[PDB]
Amino acid sequence: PISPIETVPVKLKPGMDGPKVKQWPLTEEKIKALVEICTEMEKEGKISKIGPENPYNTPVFAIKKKDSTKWRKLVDFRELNKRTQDFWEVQLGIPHPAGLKKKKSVTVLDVGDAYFSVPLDEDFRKYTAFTIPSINNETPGIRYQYNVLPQGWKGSPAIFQSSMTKILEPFKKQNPDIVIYQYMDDLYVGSDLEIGQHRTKIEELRQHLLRWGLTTPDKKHQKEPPFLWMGYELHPDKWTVQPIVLPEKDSWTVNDIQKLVGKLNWASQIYPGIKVRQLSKLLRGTKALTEVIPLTEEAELELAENREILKEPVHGVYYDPSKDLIAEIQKQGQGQWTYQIYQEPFKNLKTGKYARMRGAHTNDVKQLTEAVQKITTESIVIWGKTPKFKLPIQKETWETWWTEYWQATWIPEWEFVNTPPLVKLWYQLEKEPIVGAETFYVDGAANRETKLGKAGYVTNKGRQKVVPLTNTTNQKTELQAIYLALQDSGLEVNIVTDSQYALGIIQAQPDKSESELVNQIIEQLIKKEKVYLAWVPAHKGIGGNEQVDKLVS
Amino acid sequence: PIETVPVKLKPGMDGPKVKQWPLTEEKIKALVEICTEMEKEGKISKIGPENPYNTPVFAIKKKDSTKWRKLVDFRELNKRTQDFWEVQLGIPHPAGLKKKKSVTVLDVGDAYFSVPLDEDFRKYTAFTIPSINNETPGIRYQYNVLPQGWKGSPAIFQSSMTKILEPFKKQNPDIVIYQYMDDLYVGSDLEIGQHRTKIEELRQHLLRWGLTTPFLWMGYELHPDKWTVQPIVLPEKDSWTVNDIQKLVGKLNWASQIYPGIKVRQLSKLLRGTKALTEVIPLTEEAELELAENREILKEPVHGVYYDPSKDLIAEIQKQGQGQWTYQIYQEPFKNLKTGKYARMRGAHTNDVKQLTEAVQKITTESIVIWGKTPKFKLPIQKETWETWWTEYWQATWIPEWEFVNTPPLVKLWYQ
DNA sequence: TACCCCCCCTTCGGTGCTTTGCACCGAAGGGGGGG
Ligand SMILES: OC[C@H]1O[C@@](CO)(O[C@H]2O[C@H](CO)[C@@H](O)[C@H](O)[C@H]2O)[C@@H](O)[C@@H]1O
Ligand SMILES: *P(=O)(O)OC[C@H]1O[C@@H](n2cc(C)c(=O)[nH]c2=O)C[C@@H]1N=[N+]=[N-]
Ligand SMILES: [Mg+2]
Ligand SMILES: [Mg+2]
Ligand SMILES: [Mg+2]
Ligand SMILES: [Mg+2]
């Protein structure tokens, strides 16, 4: 005799009315399994029969459970969804195995028919109305309404999830030496109790749950490891992922590469060193999902290195709140970084990758800081604390970077790990003008209409150059003039520009750029011994700046 | 049996829907304990997913304090809640506070939990406590009483607050008292001993109402009278290189947007040839006068710059290196109400983000005392960097608005 | 012909100073995963 779950008051969006979308034609095979599933629900009380008085209908369909013999009813509620009040979702993140502590005794059980065990709001029920063709549009069919949370309604997850928590609330408080991880209907239950007292507590849990109309079928009651949970396999002293299936197809479309790259992403959480840059590059373009795409030489080298990683079987360990967290990062080239989080050597809690390329012009130091930032946040999500970092960068390098950079930047407690390739700054601009170095006053201009331009410079020794440029812009020519100065100067050079655009880019010491010309300037800067950049306002008749402004205008 | 003051959001605005951000273990523990105690006392109550609103919450320790303090980021709710100036509830600002020799800041937010909040408005104060590794879905509460950190709470409490302070004020009529959010600013010209004494009197005075009709004991001591201003200054040299004069001319040409009478003709002439940056060049007689005239112009205050109570305050901060930070507060571009510089703050030479956090807190405090407003900050830092670390260093019970900028320093304008 | 959450990579349009080009950023749509 259950104590029924109090309803959740749910309204429609002000001044909108229920759904009126008629059922699309249903293929025969579905119509039958559909009718039998309906009648079951009708016997159970999950759906009420009334249909003369309610004008509303929503289309229904049916799909099989995952790896199961059974047929599952789905309601297309997107119209109701638009008309229903917004909800605030209480599912904030996904539990991760590496956040679990080790438990002597563990159980994994699932609530059976979750949504259909929680009574819908009385007044809202009429809007869930739907119609099923009795026998392939031979006879009218029967109208029905939901008595519980229906699959397909945008408010069903939030309401079930919140109800589930209110039911579990007193059981946790009055058993403070149990740990229950609830994800929707899936419960993980761990204790350091004797498996006897554990099985008892479990049985107490199912009763309490059955007491609120929530069944826990035996078919979903895991008692022996490896526990299947959230797509992982939990053993008593180690965890791992459920097998990854890599498409080995010789012909790849767009969609094949997307699926492939996605799966590798999912593998990167425990398989160290996964790289997706080359594969992802293949994806970049207007190519539609169907078009077939040949793998680049370097792209299938990546896939091969990936296979070599997925060859071995990796496992993660669990978390010991008494040991520090440690994060170690390696540079993998071309803006790719992987890391490991662990507490004891070679026993990785988990791994991951950071490869986001943000900005047209950046350097490794910026990218490492971003990787540190992602890892700090991921760590606070899973363990609620910042790990000690081990980074491939000299203390001196970091100090020189962050103290001279014009934005505030920082990295929490860390130490140098001497693991090549090390991160370093590839050049450094002088703080003061260089005595005895040639001063190049550069400028560049383009014609807004012609897209034709010039770049050049004048020098304190009389040296001069002007170059005609086609299909260009002001900003390109400004970079070009700096390029010319660097090409034509000795190992030490003073350069005076009026390009705020150009000085902005170069002063952030980029080491890689999406622009070939910027890359060319970087290459010149690395070869130099001393470079001093200085800005002057344009059109104020300064220096050779007014003398070079008239050359290229 | 207190009747609730009705409250409405600004017409044509929904409540806040801001996602809760991840919390460290120690912060989640503090919030769970604090919310448990608050729930037993009716201050908050449990809610479900059918309330569509949310406001982020976290926890802080004030300066030199060991006890956690709940902090709600009500910035969104505050900007969606009816301005109480129209209601006439809003607090007036005393021009004399900034003139006092000592100003003490008192946390009085606790008081606000005594007053019921309008039933129809409660839904807008929803927050979600998160859990480590997402063991549990979020636990949503809403407020039943006036919440700390909401701009409505001092407004609605003003009546009770004025009645409470009335005796102390009449006894000591020279002391200025200003209420901003959860804080009380108490300024006096007394000697420090008698000042702290009067603050202690006020503390016990507040308890006597507390007994009859985060903690109160803490107190921070400002000295607004000694707040320096950092103006624009030109270097002084006997010998100028071409580089120096190019820098000087670029600086002066930027300044001309602030002081229009500034001229660079005579100085620019000295740069006619194509000369080595390093060459020393004697200043011409004309150039020396021009430079001297510009120092004079920079010495006087800008014309037509004043505080408009209807316009927002904006603050810009530049990182100058070596633990030095410069800032300007203005309402209209190039009409700076105040300029300044900080050095040797907590975190100098090891943590830019802590330094900047202190800077932001210092500037906001100055703006409250001087104008009774908090500026919107342009922060010299990447968004991701700021958002990752700032709550580790936040020690104030308010949070200013901010945005992120990336402005390479082409002229060393506010620092030589 | 369905619903809610998280993640990465790409594209694309809105926004503001580097200005009418270019850089940045968030949204949305592809994929992975969970229920
Ligand atoms: O750091 C800004 C960041 O915070 C968010 C979410 O918490 O919004 C908050 O901060 C804004 C900046 O001041 C406020 O305007 C806003 O009201 C407040 O909720 C994000 O929107 C924003 O990216
Ligand atoms: P778990 O697999 O056991 O499912 C629990 C509840 O989640 C809802 N659901 C699941 C899937 C896979 C889906 O595609 N759409 C959903 O709405 C329904 C299910 N409860 N029931 N009955
Ligand atoms: Mg289930
Ligand atoms: Mg389940
Ligand atoms: Mg130019
Ligand atoms: Mg020019």
mmCIF file of C-alpha atoms in Angstrom, chain B residues 5-312:
data_model
loop_
_atom_site.group_PDB
_atom_site.id
_atom_site.type_symbol
_atom_site.label_atom_id
_atom_site.label_comp_id
_atom_site.label_asym_id
_atom_site.label_seq_id
_atom_site.Cartn_x
_atom_site.Cartn_y
_atom_site.Cartn_z
ATOM 1 C CA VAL B 5 6.408 44.876 1.242
ATOM 2 C CA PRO B 6 5.241 43.981 -2.302
ATOM 3 C CA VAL B 7 8.019 43.848 -4.905
ATOM 4 C CA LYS B 8 7.831 43.728 -8.714
ATOM 5 C CA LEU B 9 10.492 43.211 -11.347
ATOM 6 C CA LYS B 10 10.903 45.903 -13.980
ATOM 7 C CA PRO B 11 8.055 45.545 -16.526
ATOM 8 C CA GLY B 12 9.150 43.418 -19.461
ATOM 9 C CA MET B 13 11.845 41.396 -17.686
ATOM 10 C CA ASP B 14 11.876 37.787 -16.530
ATOM 11 C CA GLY B 15 13.549 36.570 -13.366
ATOM 12 C CA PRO B 16 17.170 35.416 -13.277
ATOM 13 C CA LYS B 17 18.111 32.124 -14.930
ATOM 14 C CA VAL B 18 21.850 31.922 -14.151
ATOM 15 C CA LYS B 19 23.493 28.493 -13.944
ATOM 16 C CA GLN B 20 25.234 27.408 -10.746
ATOM 17 C CA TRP B 21 28.987 27.102 -11.208
ATOM 18 C CA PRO B 22 31.158 24.321 -9.706
ATOM 19 C CA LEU B 23 32.114 24.675 -6.035
ATOM 20 C CA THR B 24 35.150 23.358 -4.161
ATOM 21 C CA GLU B 25 34.647 20.712 -1.471
ATOM 22 C CA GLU B 26 35.160 23.125 1.422
ATOM 23 C CA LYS B 27 32.715 25.602 -0.120
ATOM 24 C CA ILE B 28 30.008 22.957 -0.691
ATOM 25 C CA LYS B 29 30.398 21.786 2.914
ATOM 26 C CA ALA B 30 30.034 25.336 4.229
ATOM 27 C CA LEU B 31 26.912 25.917 2.131
ATOM 28 C CA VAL B 32 25.250 22.643 3.121
ATOM 29 C CA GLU B 33 25.765 23.392 6.814
ATOM 30 C CA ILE B 34 24.684 27.035 6.424
ATOM 31 C CA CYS B 35 21.597 26.124 4.391
ATOM 32 C CA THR B 36 20.683 23.348 6.829
ATOM 33 C CA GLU B 37 20.751 25.797 9.748
ATOM 34 C CA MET B 38 18.854 28.384 7.702
ATOM 35 C CA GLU B 39 16.173 25.856 6.739
ATOM 36 C CA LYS B 40 15.551 24.861 10.370
ATOM 37 C CA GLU B 41 14.924 28.563 11.073
ATOM 38 C CA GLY B 42 12.531 29.152 8.171
ATOM 39 C CA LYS B 43 14.925 31.545 6.412
ATOM 40 C CA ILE B 44 14.841 29.398 3.244
ATOM 41 C CA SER B 45 12.731 26.495 2.015
ATOM 42 C CA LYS B 46 13.113 23.578 -0.379
ATOM 43 C CA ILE B 47 11.729 23.903 -3.926
ATOM 44 C CA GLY B 48 11.441 21.859 -7.104
ATOM 45 C CA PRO B 49 12.206 22.074 -10.831
ATOM 46 C CA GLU B 50 8.909 23.855 -11.573
ATOM 47 C CA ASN B 51 10.364 27.160 -10.395
ATOM 48 C CA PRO B 52 12.298 28.184 -13.550
ATOM 49 C CA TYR B 53 14.604 30.726 -11.869
ATOM 50 C CA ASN B 54 18.118 30.354 -10.488
ATOM 51 C CA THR B 55 20.847 32.555 -9.026
ATOM 52 C CA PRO B 56 24.416 31.322 -8.376
ATOM 53 C CA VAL B 57 25.576 30.914 -4.783
ATOM 54 C CA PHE B 58 29.016 30.298 -3.281
ATOM 55 C CA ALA B 59 30.948 31.080 -0.091
ATOM 56 C CA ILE B 60 33.743 33.408 1.027
ATOM 57 C CA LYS B 61 35.870 34.283 4.036
ATOM 58 C CA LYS B 62 36.165 37.989 4.757
ATOM 59 C CA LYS B 63 39.542 39.614 5.406
ATOM 60 C CA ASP B 64 41.267 37.986 8.396
ATOM 61 C CA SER B 65 38.192 35.856 9.105
ATOM 62 C CA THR B 66 38.107 32.105 9.655
ATOM 63 C CA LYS B 67 34.342 31.530 9.346
ATOM 64 C CA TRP B 68 32.630 30.846 6.018
ATOM 65 C CA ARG B 69 29.984 33.303 4.816
ATOM 66 C CA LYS B 70 27.283 32.498 2.296
ATOM 67 C CA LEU B 71 27.289 34.772 -0.748
ATOM 68 C CA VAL B 72 24.611 34.853 -3.441
ATOM 69 C CA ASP B 73 25.486 36.376 -6.834
ATOM 70 C CA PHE B 74 22.297 38.428 -7.021
ATOM 71 C CA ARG B 75 23.684 40.664 -9.781
ATOM 72 C CA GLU B 76 21.090 39.416 -12.284
ATOM 73 C CA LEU B 77 18.221 39.661 -9.783
ATOM 74 C CA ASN B 78 19.423 43.118 -8.709
ATOM 75 C CA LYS B 79 19.362 44.387 -12.301
ATOM 76 C CA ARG B 80 15.893 42.894 -12.849
ATOM 77 C CA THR B 81 14.337 44.228 -9.636
ATOM 78 C CA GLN B 82 12.358 47.477 -9.578
ATOM 79 C CA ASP B 83 14.533 50.463 -8.839
ATOM 80 C CA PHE B 84 13.479 51.698 -5.428
ATOM 81 C CA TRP B 85 14.400 55.288 -6.301
ATOM 82 C CA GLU B 86 11.017 55.461 -8.035
ATOM 83 C CA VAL B 87 9.415 53.963 -4.917
ATOM 84 C CA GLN B 88 11.311 56.622 -2.819
ATOM 85 C CA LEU B 89 12.752 53.827 -0.642
ATOM 86 C CA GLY B 90 16.281 54.430 -1.936
ATOM 87 C CA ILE B 91 18.942 55.637 0.510
ATOM 88 C CA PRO B 92 20.430 59.131 -0.013
ATOM 89 C CA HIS B 93 24.216 59.494 -0.185
ATOM 90 C CA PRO B 94 26.155 61.724 2.269
ATOM 91 C CA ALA B 95 28.873 63.820 0.617
ATOM 92 C CA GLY B 96 30.583 64.031 4.036
ATOM 93 C CA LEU B 97 31.405 60.327 4.476
ATOM 94 C CA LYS B 98 34.447 60.598 2.181
ATOM 95 C CA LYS B 99 35.653 63.607 4.208
ATOM 96 C CA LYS B 100 35.817 61.794 7.568
ATOM 97 C CA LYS B 101 39.159 60.705 9.008
ATOM 98 C CA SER B 102 38.052 57.143 9.784
ATOM 99 C CA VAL B 103 35.249 55.081 8.226
ATOM 100 C CA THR B 104 34.390 51.633 9.601
ATOM 101 C CA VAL B 105 32.493 49.028 7.560
ATOM 102 C CA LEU B 106 30.062 46.873 9.526
ATOM 103 C CA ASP B 107 28.328 43.730 8.309
ATOM 104 C CA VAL B 108 24.667 44.029 9.282
ATOM 105 C CA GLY B 109 23.191 41.640 6.730
ATOM 106 C CA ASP B 110 22.118 39.320 9.547
ATOM 107 C CA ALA B 111 19.416 41.835 10.556
ATOM 108 C CA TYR B 112 17.663 41.357 7.213
ATOM 109 C CA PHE B 113 16.681 37.777 8.029
ATOM 110 C CA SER B 114 14.156 39.124 10.568
ATOM 111 C CA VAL B 115 11.779 40.528 7.923
ATOM 112 C CA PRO B 116 9.398 38.401 5.795
ATOM 113 C CA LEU B 117 9.710 38.577 2.007
ATOM 114 C CA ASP B 118 6.650 39.068 -0.221
ATOM 115 C CA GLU B 119 5.272 35.628 -1.121
ATOM 116 C CA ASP B 120 4.925 36.462 -4.812
ATOM 117 C CA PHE B 121 8.588 37.535 -5.076
ATOM 118 C CA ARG B 122 10.214 34.586 -3.275
ATOM 119 C CA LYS B 123 10.376 32.429 -6.416
ATOM 120 C CA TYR B 124 12.954 34.821 -7.910
ATOM 121 C CA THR B 125 15.510 34.069 -5.155
ATOM 122 C CA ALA B 126 15.990 30.424 -6.178
ATOM 123 C CA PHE B 127 19.471 28.923 -5.893
ATOM 124 C CA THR B 128 20.859 25.398 -6.333
ATOM 125 C CA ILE B 129 23.511 23.854 -4.087
ATOM 126 C CA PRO B 130 25.609 21.467 -6.258
ATOM 127 C CA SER B 131 27.417 18.291 -5.159
ATOM 128 C CA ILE B 132 30.913 16.887 -5.666
ATOM 129 C CA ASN B 133 31.143 14.520 -8.658
ATOM 130 C CA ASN B 134 27.388 15.076 -9.122
ATOM 131 C CA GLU B 135 26.490 12.476 -6.511
ATOM 132 C CA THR B 136 23.057 14.103 -6.233
ATOM 133 C CA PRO B 137 20.990 16.379 -8.450
ATOM 134 C CA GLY B 138 21.064 19.962 -7.297
ATOM 135 C CA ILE B 139 19.177 20.903 -4.147
ATOM 136 C CA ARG B 140 17.078 24.006 -4.768
ATOM 137 C CA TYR B 141 16.051 26.478 -2.081
ATOM 138 C CA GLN B 142 14.276 29.820 -2.191
ATOM 139 C CA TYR B 143 14.154 32.689 0.287
ATOM 140 C CA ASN B 144 11.321 33.441 2.717
ATOM 141 C CA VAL B 145 13.001 36.460 4.341
ATOM 142 C CA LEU B 146 14.994 39.419 3.027
ATOM 143 C CA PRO B 147 18.167 37.804 1.594
ATOM 144 C CA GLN B 148 21.659 39.173 2.079
ATOM 145 C CA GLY B 149 23.097 40.581 -1.131
ATOM 146 C CA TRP B 150 19.776 41.661 -2.672
ATOM 147 C CA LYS B 151 19.358 45.387 -3.313
ATOM 148 C CA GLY B 152 15.738 45.152 -2.170
ATOM 149 C CA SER B 153 16.664 44.124 1.372
ATOM 150 C CA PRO B 154 18.294 47.378 2.601
ATOM 151 C CA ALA B 155 15.530 49.366 0.868
ATOM 152 C CA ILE B 156 12.743 47.480 2.655
ATOM 153 C CA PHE B 157 14.660 47.377 5.955
ATOM 154 C CA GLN B 158 15.504 51.116 5.955
ATOM 155 C CA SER B 159 12.509 51.973 8.162
ATOM 156 C CA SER B 160 13.540 49.581 10.929
ATOM 157 C CA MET B 161 17.198 50.553 10.447
ATOM 158 C CA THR B 162 16.676 54.300 10.880
ATOM 159 C CA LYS B 163 14.558 53.689 13.993
ATOM 160 C CA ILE B 164 17.322 51.511 15.471
ATOM 161 C CA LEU B 165 20.132 54.001 14.862
ATOM 162 C CA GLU B 166 18.099 57.082 15.910
ATOM 163 C CA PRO B 167 19.380 57.197 19.553
ATOM 164 C CA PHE B 168 23.063 56.695 18.730
ATOM 165 C CA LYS B 169 22.797 59.322 15.970
ATOM 166 C CA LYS B 170 21.269 61.956 18.268
ATOM 167 C CA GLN B 171 23.827 61.265 21.009
ATOM 168 C CA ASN B 172 26.740 61.530 18.520
ATOM 169 C CA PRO B 173 25.424 63.873 15.800
ATOM 170 C CA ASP B 174 28.854 64.402 14.198
ATOM 171 C CA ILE B 175 29.153 60.777 13.022
ATOM 172 C CA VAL B 176 28.112 59.973 9.445
ATOM 173 C CA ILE B 177 26.341 56.663 8.782
ATOM 174 C CA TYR B 178 25.673 55.308 5.284
ATOM 175 C CA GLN B 179 23.954 52.013 4.441
ATOM 176 C CA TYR B 180 25.021 50.157 1.284
ATOM 177 C CA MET B 181 23.664 46.635 0.729
ATOM 178 C CA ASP B 182 24.721 44.434 3.664
ATOM 179 C CA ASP B 183 27.232 46.977 5.002
ATOM 180 C CA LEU B 184 27.144 49.989 7.329
ATOM 181 C CA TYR B 185 29.695 52.757 6.730
ATOM 182 C CA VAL B 186 30.289 54.709 9.953
ATOM 183 C CA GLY B 187 32.611 57.710 9.566
ATOM 184 C CA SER B 188 33.923 60.123 12.188
ATOM 185 C CA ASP B 189 36.674 62.683 12.745
ATOM 186 C CA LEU B 190 37.378 61.372 16.267
ATOM 187 C CA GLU B 191 40.772 60.073 17.296
ATOM 188 C CA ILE B 192 41.147 56.391 16.464
ATOM 189 C CA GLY B 193 40.557 55.160 20.024
ATOM 190 C CA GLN B 194 37.323 57.111 20.445
ATOM 191 C CA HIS B 195 36.308 56.102 16.917
ATOM 192 C CA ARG B 196 36.620 52.361 17.581
ATOM 193 C CA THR B 197 34.970 53.033 20.937
ATOM 194 C CA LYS B 198 31.985 54.624 19.207
ATOM 195 C CA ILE B 199 31.898 51.664 16.803
ATOM 196 C CA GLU B 200 31.866 49.302 19.794
ATOM 197 C CA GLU B 201 29.015 51.319 21.319
ATOM 198 C CA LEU B 202 27.097 50.975 18.052
ATOM 199 C CA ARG B 203 27.737 47.216 18.033
ATOM 200 C CA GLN B 204 26.287 46.714 21.493
ATOM 201 C CA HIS B 205 23.486 49.097 20.536
ATOM 202 C CA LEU B 206 22.612 46.811 17.597
ATOM 203 C CA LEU B 207 22.626 43.743 19.867
ATOM 204 C CA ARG B 208 20.100 45.348 22.216
ATOM 205 C CA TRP B 209 17.599 45.512 19.364
ATOM 206 C CA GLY B 210 18.740 42.040 18.311
ATOM 207 C CA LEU B 211 17.879 40.640 21.730
ATOM 208 C CA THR B 212 14.480 42.393 21.832
ATOM 209 C CA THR B 213 12.850 43.108 18.462
ATOM 210 C CA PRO B 214 29.612 37.050 8.599
ATOM 211 C CA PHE B 215 29.239 38.151 12.143
ATOM 212 C CA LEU B 216 28.560 41.610 13.521
ATOM 213 C CA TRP B 217 31.793 41.765 15.578
ATOM 214 C CA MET B 218 34.091 42.156 12.526
ATOM 215 C CA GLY B 219 34.986 45.665 11.344
ATOM 216 C CA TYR B 220 37.192 47.237 8.644
ATOM 217 C CA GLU B 221 38.818 50.677 8.967
ATOM 218 C CA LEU B 222 39.107 53.067 5.991
ATOM 219 C CA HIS B 223 40.723 56.515 5.893
ATOM 220 C CA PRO B 224 39.078 58.356 2.967
ATOM 221 C CA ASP B 225 40.808 61.662 3.800
ATOM 222 C CA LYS B 226 44.186 60.169 2.787
ATOM 223 C CA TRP B 227 43.040 58.740 -0.595
ATOM 224 C CA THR B 228 45.625 60.011 -3.115
ATOM 225 C CA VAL B 229 44.895 60.661 -6.805
ATOM 226 C CA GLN B 230 47.305 59.561 -9.554
ATOM 227 C CA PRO B 231 47.353 62.149 -12.387
ATOM 228 C CA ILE B 232 49.016 62.121 -15.821
ATOM 229 C CA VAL B 233 52.674 63.141 -15.624
ATOM 230 C CA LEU B 234 55.285 63.790 -18.311
ATOM 231 C CA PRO B 235 58.841 62.543 -17.720
ATOM 232 C CA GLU B 236 61.611 64.957 -16.814
ATOM 233 C CA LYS B 237 64.868 64.716 -18.740
ATOM 234 C CA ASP B 238 67.795 66.964 -19.550
ATOM 235 C CA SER B 239 68.720 64.921 -22.647
ATOM 236 C CA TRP B 240 66.048 63.431 -24.919
ATOM 237 C CA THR B 241 66.626 60.673 -27.438
ATOM 238 C CA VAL B 242 64.572 60.380 -30.618
ATOM 239 C CA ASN B 243 62.851 57.421 -28.953
ATOM 240 C CA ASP B 244 62.050 59.526 -25.885
ATOM 241 C CA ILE B 245 60.530 62.317 -27.991
ATOM 242 C CA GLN B 246 58.495 59.849 -30.058
ATOM 243 C CA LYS B 247 57.153 58.413 -26.804
ATOM 244 C CA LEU B 248 56.506 61.896 -25.402
ATOM 245 C CA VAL B 249 54.632 62.962 -28.540
ATOM 246 C CA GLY B 250 52.509 59.816 -28.632
ATOM 247 C CA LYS B 251 51.656 60.296 -24.957
ATOM 248 C CA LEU B 252 50.788 63.972 -25.412
ATOM 249 C CA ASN B 253 48.664 63.232 -28.459
ATOM 250 C CA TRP B 254 46.683 60.691 -26.445
ATOM 251 C CA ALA B 255 46.328 63.157 -23.558
ATOM 252 C CA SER B 256 44.955 65.790 -25.953
ATOM 253 C CA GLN B 257 41.688 63.821 -25.890
ATOM 254 C CA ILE B 258 41.491 64.721 -22.176
ATOM 255 C CA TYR B 259 43.066 68.199 -22.163
ATOM 256 C CA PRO B 260 42.293 69.779 -25.569
ATOM 257 C CA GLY B 261 44.703 72.719 -25.294
ATOM 258 C CA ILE B 262 47.727 70.421 -25.575
ATOM 259 C CA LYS B 263 49.973 70.962 -28.612
ATOM 260 C CA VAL B 264 52.719 68.843 -30.175
ATOM 261 C CA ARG B 265 53.688 70.963 -33.196
ATOM 262 C CA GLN B 266 57.014 72.240 -31.834
ATOM 263 C CA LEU B 267 57.934 68.814 -30.466
ATOM 264 C CA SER B 268 56.910 66.933 -33.625
ATOM 265 C CA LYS B 269 59.170 69.220 -35.688
ATOM 266 C CA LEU B 270 62.189 67.940 -33.751
ATOM 267 C CA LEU B 271 61.419 64.573 -35.430
ATOM 268 C CA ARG B 272 61.579 65.736 -39.082
ATOM 269 C CA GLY B 273 64.563 63.718 -40.249
ATOM 270 C CA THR B 274 64.943 59.952 -40.480
ATOM 271 C CA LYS B 275 67.145 59.575 -37.413
ATOM 272 C CA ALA B 276 68.367 56.686 -35.282
ATOM 273 C CA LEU B 277 66.026 56.056 -32.340
ATOM 274 C CA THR B 278 69.052 56.325 -30.035
ATOM 275 C CA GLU B 279 70.247 59.758 -31.204
ATOM 276 C CA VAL B 280 70.317 62.531 -28.592
ATOM 277 C CA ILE B 281 68.779 65.765 -29.894
ATOM 278 C CA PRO B 282 68.805 69.169 -28.110
ATOM 279 C CA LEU B 283 65.363 70.609 -27.468
ATOM 280 C CA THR B 284 64.606 73.760 -29.468
ATOM 281 C CA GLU B 285 63.572 76.928 -27.649
ATOM 282 C CA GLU B 286 60.030 76.575 -29.046
ATOM 283 C CA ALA B 287 59.856 72.918 -27.973
ATOM 284 C CA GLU B 288 60.903 73.732 -24.404
ATOM 285 C CA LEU B 289 58.093 76.284 -24.100
ATOM 286 C CA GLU B 290 55.604 73.842 -25.627
ATOM 287 C CA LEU B 291 56.607 71.148 -23.130
ATOM 288 C CA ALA B 292 56.420 73.553 -20.181
ATOM 289 C CA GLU B 293 53.004 74.793 -21.324
ATOM 290 C CA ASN B 294 51.816 71.178 -21.483
ATOM 291 C CA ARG B 295 52.944 70.432 -17.926
ATOM 292 C CA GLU B 296 50.930 73.479 -16.845
ATOM 293 C CA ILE B 297 47.827 72.254 -18.698
ATOM 294 C CA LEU B 298 48.188 68.791 -17.147
ATOM 295 C CA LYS B 299 48.483 70.396 -13.699
ATOM 296 C CA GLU B 300 45.004 71.931 -13.830
ATOM 297 C CA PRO B 301 41.785 69.897 -13.598
ATOM 298 C CA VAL B 302 39.833 68.896 -16.673
ATOM 299 C CA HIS B 303 37.001 71.249 -17.594
ATOM 300 C CA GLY B 304 33.379 70.168 -17.278
ATOM 301 C CA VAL B 305 33.883 66.884 -15.433
ATOM 302 C CA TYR B 306 31.468 66.122 -12.623
ATOM 303 C CA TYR B 307 29.368 63.333 -11.185
ATOM 304 C CA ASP B 308 25.959 62.763 -12.773
ATOM 305 C CA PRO B 309 23.808 60.706 -10.362
ATOM 306 C CA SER B 310 21.813 59.229 -13.256
ATOM 307 C CA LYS B 311 24.797 57.812 -15.182
ATOM 308 C CA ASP B 312 26.673 54.616 -14.385
#
